[PDB]
Symmetry: C3
């Protein structure tokens, strides 16, 4: 086993940290600096938060693209996440799938796939929890 740490920058200047754990030809990647905790029987959490400005388009479509910048590519299979989308008028709490992909042009992306498009602008997306990311 070996480990590598890395990060990406979002368009608004946010930093996404990650840690890759390699066991043979499979890698498992976790995102840092967020998650659930139980503190004296009360659930608390720190989400990973994206702004509408971090998306290619801020409309709450059923496919969303977050272009990233950083030193290295990250290419994964999709993983399930619990996300909260804040619009001006609504709060949408939903399971989604997300996947790290690299564009043919070499740009890293995080892609989020949802069930239902809305004609509303994303103010925030909060990732509450996500299954680890697998790469073969």
């Amino acid at each position: 086993v070996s480990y590598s740490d890395g990060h990406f920058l979002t368009k608004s200047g946010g930093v996404i940290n990650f840690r890759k754990t390699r066991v043979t030809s499979i890698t498992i990647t976790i995102l840092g600096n967020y998650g659930l905790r139980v503190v004296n029987g009360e659930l608390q959490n720190t989400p990973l938060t994206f702004k509408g400005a971090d998306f290619k388009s801020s409309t709450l479509k059923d496919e969303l693209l977050i272009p990233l910048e950083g030193a290295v590519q990250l290419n994964t299979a999709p993983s399930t996440a619990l996300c909260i989308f804040i619009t001006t008028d609504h709060v949408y709490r939903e399971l989604c799938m997300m996947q790290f992909l690299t564009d043919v042009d070499k740009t890293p992306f995080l892609v989020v796939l949802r069930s239902e498009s809305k004609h509303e602008t994303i103010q925030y997306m909060h990732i509450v929890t996500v299954h680890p990311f697998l790469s073969l």
Copy 2:
């Protein structure tokens, strides 16, 4: 690779069995005594069933806490499950995320995150199937 078996007790006296498979610094945990089968082209299943009494609060909130007792901690990333919630008036079939966490006070918990809160009391939660639990 090595393997460890364990269990937890729920508040109502239910036993949750699990098996951990360790490969280097990643552990994969499966829960025992439940699942899907196909028998002469017909799907059958044995769910893992929790009572309302097993939850910290039995209200069908969008965050649920199941306090456990047992010999060892179990700390995992979240995994997706298909659950069935039975209330007095309704049956809710839904994908959820669940995660094993340990309280700062050392109490083991199973946490279930859902999309939509209901002002109803849980009679039962049936776990129909769940993706294996990963721990790094």
Copy 3:
């Protein structure tokens, strides 16, 4: 680590290719010939497509069975997928769980579990993306 390739035939004559990666007693299986890509900032995809004719019953039930034929069994835990169901009147985009199981009679199946039954006939199911399949 070792690798094995295989395939299954569906009732309509479709071929499902898969690749198994074995690391000790855990196997990770990916399905071939489909997935997401980003091409100059635009998301494209090739789904894995099943016909209504591939199911045991074509009704859009909350449990679906796809009987397969091939040289070897494939038995997995459930994984989350984003699927699109096309009926004559509707398009349903949803997260589902799917699992490869073997019948007591030795027939391989792919089983799909959904949240909500509809009294409609499946024309197509498109698998857009699915988390890799784990077997212990």
